[PDB]
């Protein structure tokens, strides 16, 4: 609920940071869709998001707040 709203705010931050690179935003969306559809483990999603946001270290740190513990 609060966590859902925090997730909405975070994904919006990604969308606006990559407003001129929609393919990167789209890739982030597909990482999550693939995670769910292929039942990938957390560590594989962590690897993919780390690579995607290599030049966006603040977005990477924000992502980690959604991970277990």
């Amino acid at each position: 609920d609060v966590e859902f709203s925090q997730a909405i705010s975070y994904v919006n931050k990604i969308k606006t940071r990559f407003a001129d690179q929609p393919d990167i935003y789209k890739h982030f969306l597909e990482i999550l869709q693939t995670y769910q559809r292929e039942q990938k483990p957390i560590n594989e999603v962590y690897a993919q998001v780390t690579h995607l946001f290599q030049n966006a270290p603040d977005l990477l740190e924000d992502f980690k707040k959604f991970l277990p513990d």
Binding site: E3, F4, Q6, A7, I8, Y10, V11, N12, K15, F28, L29, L32, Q33, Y35, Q36, I42, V45, F66, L67, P68, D69
Partner: peptide, 16 residues
């Protein structure tokens, strides 16, 4: 749109 955004939020918010 906001659909894709809310979908990603739902998946993200359920990993922990």
């Amino acid at each position: 749109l906001d659909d894709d955004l809310g979908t990603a939020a739902a998946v993200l918010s359920n990993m922990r």
